Nucleic acid binder design. Structure first.
Length: 293
DNA sequence: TTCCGATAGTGGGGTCGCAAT
């Protein structure tokens, strides 16, 4: 009845791929954490910050899925309030409870929510803790593109990362949902822009010893020792109207080949790219290359 | 045959912990 691996959403690109009716909720820009005896991270590791871990373990019932987030604080702030091994943590913090696996991970989302709602009725005190504020994310029923778009405007105005779209009957898949499956979709609005290439960096093959991880997936260390330099581009430093940062994703095999092949004659060129504004500290967040010119 | 889920790989930004400076 436990959760093998956390549920992961798929990136929604075409608003047309959304199936209706569907239930939606706001996507928090916090840190994922599921309750399995104790509080675990997206990679099922224990939440470093013991105060939180311990606290949440007392309030949250076994099998709670949600995100830890410091209200008002920046992402980098919340990151620290969770990734640090605090002995004593006095500051306040919230936990957005959005899923609940009591027994069968095949129970329709709506029902899993119901199970979450019920638990609350029985333990109202959880939503009243003096420090930890537990926030139940009860989905909203969306019937068509129009309503959805309306919802996006709402959550966004309220300062959320985006919106999570789920299938009413959807199950708690132990893995990343697919577009077609439509179990859990992530809807984020990136922004277009352009920057000027100023330099390039070689691709690096991580030849570190291959092992297994908490879920049994290929895991390799990141020691520079086992980093062999490939003869192709890996990332490109660019100047976005003043600000400088790198872009290394969004390129295909042949592109990385060309870009590196003409590293010298490529400098100075203008390239398009998309990025997310929210969360950006000193440079664009999730920078993704799109094309040249 | 084509199509698609699942998976290894490679990339960004940014913080924590720890040894070295």
């Amino acid at each position: 009845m436990a959760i093998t691996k956390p549920l992961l959403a798929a990136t929604l690109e075409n608003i047309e791929d959304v199936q209706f009716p569907c239930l939606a909720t706001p996507k928090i820009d916090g840190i994922r954490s599921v309750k399995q005896t104790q509080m675990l991270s997206r990679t099922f590791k224990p939440i470093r910050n013991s105060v939180m871990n311990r606290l949440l373990t007392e309030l949250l019932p076994e099998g709670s899925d949600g995100e830890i987030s410091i209200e008002g604080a920046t992402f980098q702030d919340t990151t620290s309030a969770v990734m640090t091994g605090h002995k004593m943590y006095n500051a306040k913090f919230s936990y957005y409870w959005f899923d609940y696996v009591t027994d069968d991970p095949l129970k329709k989302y709506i029902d899993r929510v119901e199970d979450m709602k019920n638990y609350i009725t029985v333990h109202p005190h959880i939503l009243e803790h003096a420090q930890v504020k537990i926030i139940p994310l009860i989905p909203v029923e969306i019937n068509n593109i129009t309503e959805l778009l309306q919802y996006e405007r709402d959550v966004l105005s309220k300062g959320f990362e985006g919106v999570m779209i789920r299938k009413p009957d959807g199950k708690y898949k132990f893995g990343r949902s697919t577009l077609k499956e439509g179990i859990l979709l992530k809807m984020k609005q990136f922004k277009d822009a352009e920057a000027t290439i100023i330099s390039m960096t070689a691709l690096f093959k991580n030849t570190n010893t291959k092992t297994k991880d908490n879920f049994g997936y290929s895991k390799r260390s990141t020691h520079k020792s086992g980093k062999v330099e490939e003869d192709v581009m890996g990332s490109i430093e660019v100047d976005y109207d003043g600000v400088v940062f790198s872009i290394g994703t969004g390129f295909d095999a042949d592109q990385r080949r060309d870009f590196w092949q003409n590293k010298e004659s490529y400098i100075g060129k203008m390239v398009k790219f998309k990025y997310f504004e929210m969360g950006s500290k000193d440079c664009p967040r999730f920078p993704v290359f799109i094309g040249i010119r």
